[model samples]
Target chain A: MQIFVKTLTGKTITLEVEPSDTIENVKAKIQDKEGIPPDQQRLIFAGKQLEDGRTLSDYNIQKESTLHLVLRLRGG
Target chain B: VDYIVEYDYDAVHDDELTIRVGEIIRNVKKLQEEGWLEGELNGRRGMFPDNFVKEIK
Candidate 1:
């Protein structure tokens, strides 16, 4: 399936992956394309954080689903 | 819009703006394409990451 990763900057990228792929894997792909470290990337869908250990299927993410990306702030 | 700095954000690079917690920034213009806000603070104008500040309204 495919998903749309939308950054806070309003940039969107399409990612193709299996439903079994973990959120961490998605973060890795985002890191590769956006230059944001996985640790710094906060993925939110449906108003909740997407746990790294969970699969996209676990979240019921479907093709064309939109995942919002926010960069975690350090030293608040 | 106005915003209050929720956290002290130190500039990661010289080009970035540094803001202190509790500082009031006015005329904040959200640069949606950049994921940042162009704001005026203490008579200085610069851009800060959107997450670093909270909108007043």
Candidate 2:
């Protein structure tokens, strides 16, 4: 299914993921696309963390679903 | 070009940023230190872009 990954940087990037792809993998991919560091990445949907290694089967993420990826660093 | 750093609250995710006003001030300061941001405070709002900041007025 296709999902929309919205970064804190205000970019709405799209991703196509198989049902087997884990949330962790998607997180890394989003970081790569947004040019943000993976270490600073945070994934949240419906106000909850997208657990690492959790698959789409675990969350049953649907198409057109939007997820937020936040990059946290020590800055103002 | 006029530049202003911004964030979207609703669309904010792990990488998403919410406009803090304070953070904008901080980032602007950093930019000034680096000599990137250049503008007089004429009290105009900025624009919203897809990346780190919005637009400038």
Candidate 3:
């Protein structure tokens, strides 16, 4: 299935994944395209945060779903 | 983070969320475009004007 990512700046990024895909897996994909580190990546889908321990199917994520990406602003 | 809705805001666009005064909103992600924000309340996710809510933390 395919999915989408939205940035705060209003740009949209696209990705293809399976329902078994994990949050970190997709975040890595985001990093490959836009270069935002996965550690700084926080994703929100529907109304809840996507946890790294869960799969896309766990959250009922479907094709064309839009996940909002919030990048941690500061370095640790 | 938690935010207190200082004022009531009606949704102007289809994607925006309506917030009631004195209610609390949680898990806000700063939309960062001229003070817009994305937050969730009552299981719904949408945008809200940042000025309408004061971040408590």
Which candidate leads the pack in TM-score?
A: 3
List, residue by residue over A1-76, the lDDT tens digit for candidate 2.
7888765444578987877898778867766766656666766565355777688777677778877655443121
Candidate 2: residue B47 lDDT (0-100): 20
Give the poorly placed runs of model 2, Cα more than 4 Å off.
Answer: A73-76, B1-57
Ordered by TM-score, highest first, the candidates read 3, 1, 2
Q: Pick the candidate with the highest lDDT.
A: 1
In model 2, the Cα lDDT at residue B56 comes to 53
**lDDT measured at residue B22 in model 3 versus the true structure, 0 to 100:** 75
Better of 2 and 3 by TM-score: 3
TM-score of 3: 0.58
CAPRI class assigned to model 1: incorrect
What TM-scores do the predictions have?
Answer: 0.55, 0.51, 0.58
Model 2 per-residue lDDT at A4: 81
Off by over 4 Å in 1: A74-76, B1-57
lDDT of 3 by residue, A1-76 (tens): 8887766666778887999899888888888988988887877665456898899999899998877665444111
Higher-lDDT candidate of 1 and 2: 1
